[PDB]
Amino acid sequence: EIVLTQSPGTLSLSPGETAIISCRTSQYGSLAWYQQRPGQAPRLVIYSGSTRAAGIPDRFSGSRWGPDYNLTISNLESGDFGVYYCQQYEFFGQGTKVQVD
Amino acid sequence: AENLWVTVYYGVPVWKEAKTTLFCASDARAYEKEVHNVWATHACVPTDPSPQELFLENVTENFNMWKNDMVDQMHEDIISLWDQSLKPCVKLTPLCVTLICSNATVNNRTAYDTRSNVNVTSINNTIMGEMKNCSFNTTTEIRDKEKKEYALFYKPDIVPLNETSNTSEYRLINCNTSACTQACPKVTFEPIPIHYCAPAGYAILKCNNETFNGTGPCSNVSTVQCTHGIRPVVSTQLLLNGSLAEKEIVIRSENLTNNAKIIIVHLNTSVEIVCTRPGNNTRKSVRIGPGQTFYATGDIIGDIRQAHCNISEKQWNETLQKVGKELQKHFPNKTIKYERSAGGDMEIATHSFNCGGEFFYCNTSKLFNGTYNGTDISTITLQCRIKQIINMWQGVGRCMYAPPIAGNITCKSNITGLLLTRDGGTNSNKTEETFRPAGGDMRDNWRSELYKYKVVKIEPLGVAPTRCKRRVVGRRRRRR
Amino acid sequence: SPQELFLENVTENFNMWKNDMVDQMHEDIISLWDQSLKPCVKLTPLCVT
Amino acid sequence: LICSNATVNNRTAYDTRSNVNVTSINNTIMGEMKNCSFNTTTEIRDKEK
Amino acid sequence: AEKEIVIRSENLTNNAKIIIVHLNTSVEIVCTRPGNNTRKSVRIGPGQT
Amino acid sequence: AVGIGAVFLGFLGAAGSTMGAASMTLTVQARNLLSGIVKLTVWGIKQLQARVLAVERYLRDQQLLGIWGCSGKLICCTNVPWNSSWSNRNLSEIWDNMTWLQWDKEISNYTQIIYGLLEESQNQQEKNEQDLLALD
Amino acid sequence: AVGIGAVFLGFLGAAGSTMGAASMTLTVQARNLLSGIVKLTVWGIKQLQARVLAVERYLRDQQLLGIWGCSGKLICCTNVPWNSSWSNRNLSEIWDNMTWLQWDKEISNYTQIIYGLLEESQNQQEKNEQDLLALD
Amino acid sequence: AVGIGAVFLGFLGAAGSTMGAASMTLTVQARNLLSGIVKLTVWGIKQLQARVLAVERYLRDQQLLGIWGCSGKLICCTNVPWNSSWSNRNLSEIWDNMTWLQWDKEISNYTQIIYGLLEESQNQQEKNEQDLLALD
Ligand SMILES: *[C@@H]1O[C@H](CO)[C@@H](O[C@@H]2O[C@H](CO)[C@@H](O[C@@H]3O[C@H](CO[C@H]4O[C@H](CO)[C@@H](O)[C@H](O)[C@@H]4O)[C@@H](O)[C@H](O[C@H]4O[C@H](CO)[C@@H](O)[C@H](O)[C@@H]4O)[C@@H]3O)[C@H](O)[C@H]2NC(C)=O)[C@H](O)[C@H]1NC(C)=O
Ligand SMILES: *[C@@H]1O[C@H](CO)[C@@H](O[C@@H]2O[C@H](CO)[C@@H](O[C@@H]3O[C@H](CO)[C@@H](O)[C@H](O)[C@@H]3O)[C@H](O)[C@H]2NC(C)=O)[C@H](O)[C@H]1NC(C)=O
Ligand SMILES: *[C@@H]1O[C@H](CO)[C@@H](O[C@@H]2O[C@H](CO)[C@@H](O[C@@H]3O[C@H](CO)[C@@H](O)[C@H](O)[C@@H]3O)[C@H](O)[C@H]2NC(C)=O)[C@H](O)[C@H]1NC(C)=O
Ligand SMILES: *[C@@H]1O[C@H](CO)[C@@H](O[C@@H]2O[C@H](CO)[C@@H](O[C@@H]3O[C@H](CO)[C@@H](O)[C@H](O)[C@@H]3O)[C@H](O)[C@H]2NC(C)=O)[C@H](O)[C@H]1NC(C)=O
Ligand SMILES: *[C@@H]1O[C@H](CO)[C@@H](O[C@@H]2O[C@H](CO)[C@@H](O[C@@H]3O[C@H](CO)[C@@H](O)[C@H](O)[C@@H]3O)[C@H](O)[C@H]2NC(C)=O)[C@H](O)[C@H]1NC(C)=O
Ligand SMILES: *[C@@H]1O[C@H](CO)[C@@H](O[C@@H]2O[C@H](CO)[C@@H](O)[C@H](O)[C@H]2NC(C)=O)[C@H](O)[C@H]1NC(C)=O
Ligand SMILES: *[C@@H]1O[C@H](CO)[C@@H](O[C@@H]2O[C@H](CO)[C@@H](O)[C@H](O)[C@H]2NC(C)=O)[C@H](O)[C@H]1NC(C)=O
Ligand SMILES: *[C@@H]1O[C@H](CO)[C@@H](O)[C@H](O)[C@H]1NC(C)=O
Ligand SMILES: *[C@@H]1O[C@H](CO)[C@@H](O)[C@H](O)[C@H]1NC(C)=O
Numbered sequence A: 001e002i003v004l005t006q007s008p009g010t011l012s013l014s015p016g017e018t019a020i021i022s023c024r025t026s027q028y029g030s031l032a033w034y035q036q037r038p039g040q041a042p043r044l045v046i047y048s049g050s051t052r053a054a055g056i057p058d059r060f061s062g063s064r065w066g067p068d069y070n071l072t073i074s075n076l077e078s079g080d081f082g083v084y085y086c087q088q089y090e091f092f093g094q095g096t097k098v099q100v101d
Numbered sequence B: 001a002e003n004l005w006v007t008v009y010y011g012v013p014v015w016k017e018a019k020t021t022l023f024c025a026s027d028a029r030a031y032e033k034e035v036h037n038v039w040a041t042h043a044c045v046p047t048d049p050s051p052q053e054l055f056l057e058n059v060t061e062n063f064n065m066w067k068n069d070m071v072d073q074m075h076e077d078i079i080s081l082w083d084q085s086l087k088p089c090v091k092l093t094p095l096c097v098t099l100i101c102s103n104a105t106v107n108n109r110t111a112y113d114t115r116s117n118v119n120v121t122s123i124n125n126t127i128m129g130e131m132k133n134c135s136f137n138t139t140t141e142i143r144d145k146e147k148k149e150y151a152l153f154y155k156p157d158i159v160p161l162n163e164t165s166n167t168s169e170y171r172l173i174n175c176n177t178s179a180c181t182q183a184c185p186k187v188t189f190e191p192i193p194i195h196y197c198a199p200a201g202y203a204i205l206k207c208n209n210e211t212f213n214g215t216g217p218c219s220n221v222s223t224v225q226c227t228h229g230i231r232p233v234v235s236t237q238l239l240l241n242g243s244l245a246e247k248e249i250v251i252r253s254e255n256l257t258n259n260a261k262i263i264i265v266h267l268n269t270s271v272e273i274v275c276t277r278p279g280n281n282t283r284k285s286v287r288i289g290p291g292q293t294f295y296a297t298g299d300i301i302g303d304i305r306q307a308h309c310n311i312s313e314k315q316w317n318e319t320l321q322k323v324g325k326e327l328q329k330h331f332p333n334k335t336i337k338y339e340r341s342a343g344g345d346m347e348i349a350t351h352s353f354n355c356g357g358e359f360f361y362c363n364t365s366k367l368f369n370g371t372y373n374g375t376d377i378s379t380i381t382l383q384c385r386i387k388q389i390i391n392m393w394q395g396v397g398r399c400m401y402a403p404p405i406a407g408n409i410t411c412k413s414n415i416t417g418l419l420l421t422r423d424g425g426t427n428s429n430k431t432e433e434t435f436r437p438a439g440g441d442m443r444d445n446w447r448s449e450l451y452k453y454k455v456v457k458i459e460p461l462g463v464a465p466t467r468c469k470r471r472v473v474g475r476r477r478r479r480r
Numbered sequence C: 001s002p003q004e005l006f007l008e009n010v011t012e013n014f015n016m017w018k019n020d021m022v023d024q025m026h027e028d029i030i031s032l033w034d035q036s037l038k039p040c041v042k043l044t045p046l047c048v049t
Numbered sequence D: 001l002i003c004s005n006a007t008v009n010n011r012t013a014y015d016t017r018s019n020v021n022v023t024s025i026n027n028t029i030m031g032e033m034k035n036c037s038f039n040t041t042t043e044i045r046d047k048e049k
Numbered sequence E: 001a002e003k004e005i006v007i008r009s010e011n012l013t014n015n016a017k018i019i020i021v022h023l024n025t026s027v028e029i030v031c032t033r034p035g036n037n038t039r040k041s042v043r044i045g046p047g048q049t
Numbered sequence F, G, H: 001a002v003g004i005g006a007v008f009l010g011f012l013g014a015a016g017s018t019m020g021a022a023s024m025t026l027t028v029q030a031r032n033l034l035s036g037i038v039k040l041t042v043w044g045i046k047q048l049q050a051r052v053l054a055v056e057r058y059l060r061d062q063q064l065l066g067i068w069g070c071s072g073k074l075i076c077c078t079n080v081p082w083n084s085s086w087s088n089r090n091l092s093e094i095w096d097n098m099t100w101l102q103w104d105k106e107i108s109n110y111t112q113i114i115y116g117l118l119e120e121s122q123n124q125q126e127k128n129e130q131d132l133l134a135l136d
């Protein structure tokens, strides 16, 4: 079924501000987030819900109970912008684009 | 504290979930500790395996089949057994001489499947036709004279086209990577049942509430000193000579939604399978070195064109139907659609097993070609192939050469469980119904038997408050 | 040093043929010769005509 | 083993500001190290290279 | 050694006996083999390299 | 917390019952803790390792009992009072409700103090007995 | 059936004599039961096997003595009465005629009853003493 | 020659002090004497040899204590009088000057008699107690 769905797809944010992205999972399972650096290979950021990936600062965090997960990125620097993907065992979300003003 | 004193207790019934090495207990008895190996005569202990089960009043315990380390213990013990048993035997290194090969010839034999004599191998295409007749120079014992021996090899055992595409010159496939060792004749060994007994100070618990999915609590717990007889059989795409569940068909995965995780299906009624290699193989014996002998198949006499396995149609059909019904319960409101094997190496793209020291490989496309909760709406024959050169386990570096067995060979077996995986990405409305057979590590085979058990160490010392002060006074205390 | 001791009134049945110590000697001797001769030279290259 | 002096395909020397010219003067690693070629058996025991 | 340099022999007058000297401050040594060696791999036998 | 014992249960069959009912089987668990079960191959090492580990487990347990003055008995009354730290435990559930498998969880995190107290009390009693005998 | 013990015989030198005299050599048999005797080769396995079996046998014997309330003594009086089923044995021949090597053949076929009776009586006495201490 | 023991020292930290200020690590010394420390290779033989030798040492010591009636205690008063041949030793320095490491040298060349004396006295006491119980 439609196991993943992200929103908002498009976002505009000035540096130093806090970002917000939401992914809804329609079935029980793990959840995670990715960071596609533009024109580069994406990389893991958060996995197993709230646990951060290796080497990622505490700017990156999130949480859920059941279907709805909120991702928040406090003090988004210029280099941290890009496109973020939600993933669950095989699926990918439609992605959410954040650009720097 | 004028009414309150400690008291030491010993022999108290408490235990914790540690891990330890276990004793190997044999069938009691089929061993001969140096004369010949049947499974572990050099190594394992021939002692009485009587389980002597005990039921417990109100115990509730948590089990987990996936984390059961006894399957790892089985894996290590099996690899050590095979490695130490194959070490003294012959080396095949002198046999890697350049081989010149040609199509085989038949001296007017008959064919089973047609009422006429054999005329040509290309049409009489089984055993003969897939076998190459190879002759090669070999060193005699005295190291200064050589002679033209000959032997027949299965086509998978030889490799052209690295000898250039127009030479008709062949090597043994192993020489590209490693040197093989022949299995000793007297060492030949078969799936004898084996029992595991805990060492002193450890107790092997068992769960009798068979319907549990493989995790979580269990209430019908029991204690056993030595497990029942597990047969160390190894096969792919199908468990055979296994146990059976007292309920109807049982299915166990750590997460069914996690598609990459294998799905083990455990049957309640066995489906009989018969496999046979007709035709009388003649064991040729050719000399190597001073005192080493190599065995190879000479000419095959008798009728030739068969290497088959047979399964009852309706029995297997209804078994697959009940599997489909259970998987439909687990996956609600969608059909079930079995399919051909996904692919991969020959050892997992085909059903694999051994009978009488000969390794069989069988195309299973006839068997899983199903539809909604069963087959689409008499015996099913599986075409098969045979290899002599064997990689020991899946992809481990230990190679082998299996000596041929003379005369027609036939074996029977009881199919008891299936090994399946699921289709991946979606395409939701047309994907969930697909399942396929898949290969499996030996851990997957042994878990279907050792899901039952758990190992715990006794903690025979405990403390509690009682009514005594040593040599001095009594106590006032409470009750329920 | 054997340090023999004599017993007052003991009577015991001996059997030389069933004495398993000869089997123990047999196994020990074969193991000794086999394990001692294992590291030594092989004569296989010398089998020339 | 049949051996001969080594050859250098236009490398450079640390210790002086010039390209390598001859091993006898460029005498370290090169010069103390011999280039040897030898017949060896392949895996099939009937071909050599 | 925590004290300054230390010297040890069972008899210094016994000249043949080795004299071990133990320092208090280490002296750094750097050793290097420049040049990129290229590991050639040649086959021997069935499965030996 | 105590009961008239027996040995005919063979092994760990209770379990489950409360401590005042599970304290009967001390003889059988004491017995089975050590007794039993009993070309070049190495599992002799495995068997010897298992036997030696079992023997050292038994010897450590017996030594700990011996230091506290309890060697030679399964039940053992001692002098160490229940500490000033607890004065709280749920004895109505001790006598007839909790099994040993449950009670073992409620004494964890604190067992380390008990052995020290037992050792100190036993050594004090030993020297006191010598002081008594030295006066006659 | 009993005698003033001795250790100067070195080893099993008696034997032979009646139980009332052969019961004096307990110390030396107890001592010698465990003490002593003490390129790639495997007889280290043999030595370790022998040592481990000897130690295990000694530990089993000591445990059986401990369950019956006899650990710490060679002689040990107990409470179990002479069996209801026996009431017939040849005690005039026990005291001064039969040696232990002969008497051991007569107590066979019945020892397994004694190894249960002793522990039953010991556990009864243990709980009785615990109750008596709890009485105050 | 005696005092109130302790266990927090961990290991052999005294040593050095006189016997009356050194016979107090008995608990910890008894503990550490046996406890701990815990492709084809043979050092399993070495480990098993070390473990078995340590276990046999402990068992021999415990057996020697058991024969003398001292098993179950670290301190143990006994009945054997001071030897007729000695009657001389420097007890003023036994109590508060000599450490154990020094005193152990002065009892050498005479220890072998003491074990026999203890054994004989204990066996005499054993048979005497058995006779006393059999009197009535
Ligand atoms: C799954 O379970 C089935 C049983 O349900 C097993 O079937 C057995 O398979 C083994 C081989 O794996 C068979 O063993 C062979 O049997 C031959 C026939 O035995 C009969 O005939 C002989 C006389 O010819 C009689 O003496 C005998 O009592 C039987 O009546 C034997 O001739 C074979 O002998 C060879 O092997 C032995 C053992 O190594 C050697 O000592 C011999 O010298 C000789 O080399 C062999 O014993 C067995 O017969 C099968 N039993 C049945 C009932 O079918 C499956 O093996 C098992 N596993 C799998 C994967 O299916
Ligand atoms: C497995 O199943 C297959 C197919 O059901 C069996 O094949 C049958 O084998 C027998 C001989 O074992 C054949 O018998 C011969 O039939 C011809 C007529 O076709 C007759 O003229 C001969 O005299 C002889 O009787 C039979 O034809 C053949 N069936 C088919 C459909 O080919 C097989 O025997 C089963 N068992 C094994 C071990 O393979
Ligand atoms: C098991 O046996 C079956 C039947 O013998 C095998 O099926 C055959 O597999 C080959 C190779 O995948 C198929 O070849 C393909 O044929 C099509 C034309 O149909 C062609 O366009 C392709 O380029 C390719 O050549 C073949 O069609 C197929 N036949 C049938 C009837 O299924 C199967 O491969 C065997 N599997 C194993 C694991 O042995
Ligand atoms: C799930 O599938 C089964 C069939 O696979 C449906 O039940 C009925 O099952 C019986 C027994 O297998 C079928 O009779 C048999 O058919 C086979 C051919 O597949 C034939 O070889 C046997 O001799 C026997 O005649 C029966 O046809 C089948 N019924 C139908 C309508 O196909 C079951 O209905 C399926 N589940 C659901 C929810 O429909
Ligand atoms: C060890 O000590 C020796 C001697 O102090 C060091 O030798 C020096 O190595 C450097 C390169 O690593 C040489 O640099 C070159 O110098 C020439 C001028 O002579 C210049 O034209 C080049 O562009 C380059 O800079 C340096 O000449 C050489 N010194 C001497 C006296 O030969 C050596 O580097 C030290 N380290 C090691 C690991 O050997
Ligand atoms: C396999 O090849 C060998 C060697 O060519 C065959 O053995 C020879 O067969 C011929 C007749 O075809 C005889 O004259 C020879 O005496 C045989 N032996 C030798 C050493 O040459 C053998 O018959 C072939 N087998 C098959 C099944 O084709
Ligand atoms: C070491 O000797 C070998 C063999 O002579 C050299 O390899 C050959 O070099 C020639 C040119 O000098 C090439 O044409 C060949 O193709 C090379 N290979 C063979 C198999 O002949 C190698 O260059 C020498 N190396 C040095 C450092 O002198
Ligand atoms: C087999 O029989 C046919 C017909 O009788 C004959 O032509 C042929 O030579 C015989 N032998 C072989 C090897 O085909
Ligand atoms: C697979 O099953 C379908 C059912 O419609 C049948 O038409 C087809 O012939 C079968 N193929 C094989 C190879 O069994």
Ligand SMILES: *[C@@H]1O[C@H](CO)[C@@H](O)[C@H](O)[C@H]1NC(C)=O
Pocket: D008, D009, D010, D021
């Ligand atoms: C190295 O360079 C010199 C000068 O450019 C040239 O003469 C020579 O052929 C080159 N090669 C060798 C192997 O010296």
